[PDB]
Amino acid sequence: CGYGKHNGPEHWHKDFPIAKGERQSPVDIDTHTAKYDPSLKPLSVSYDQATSLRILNNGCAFNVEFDDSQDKAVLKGGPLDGTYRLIQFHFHWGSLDGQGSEHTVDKKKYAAELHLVHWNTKYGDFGKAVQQPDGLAVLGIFLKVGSAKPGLQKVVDVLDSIKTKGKSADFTNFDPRGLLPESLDYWTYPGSLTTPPLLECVTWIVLKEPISVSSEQVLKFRKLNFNGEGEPEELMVDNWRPAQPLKNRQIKASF
Ligand SMILES: [Zn+2]
Hints:
Pfam families: Carb_anhydrase (PF00194). The chain is mostly beta strands. The protein is 7% helix and 29% strand. It has a single domain (1-255), classed as Alpha carbonic anhydrase (Carbonic Anhydrase II, Roll), CATH 3.10.200. The protein has helices spanning 126-129, 153-158, 215-221, and strands spanning 28-29, 35-36, 43-46, 52-57, 62-66, 74-77, 84-93, 104-105, 112-120, 136-145, 168-170, 186-191, 202-207, 211-213, 252-253. Strands 2, 3, 4, 5, 6, 7, 9, 10, 11, 12, 13, 14 and 15 form a 13-stranded mixed β-sheet that branches. It has a two-stranded parallel sheet with strand order 1-8. Zinc ion binds at residues 90, 92, 115, 194.
């Protein structure tokens, strides 16, 4: 995941030619071209039994990891067929409050974007699922800066213990329901992972309503480091891929 001046997103296609593929993410969501789809079934976010395990700085972002060895936290419904298990969430964010999201809405960039990553249980494990066109479902939630998000603060306050690449910390009993907005109204389209290997295995479900976080919460994201301990400091900021061509896809609205 290079995001620097010399290995950023514009360079990824040399190692990962699918970077110029037909169903790459993120995309700009043009709210006046998306169409309401009455065939969509209700979206079901079932996180009551979620079991968080750990938080890891992987040099790209930080991942909050879940126990996915049973259907404890699943996403169903919407555009999805079957059951998708929560494996981790992470964020992308900017150096400045006016940038950081991956998806855009009518070209608007948000300060950050939350990705709750789920895999289709029919494929047995995550690594098999990413090889399938319907392998993953990613729930995307925009972050704007305004009032503090109480449900995010436990995350913010462990970041000091995972400052550098390769550090992890115990992160049990975190409830990801605290990161959801009130409304589950969404846009959906077929896409890809937004970091290498950029595999075209994702059904994207992007919520229309952003959550608000405070300036102080996002400033703590920006104190993380892309580098490992003992290396020259490179602040973990602007870890987002810009919008990719929509090509032969239709974005559908649930509302
Ligand atoms: Zn992501």
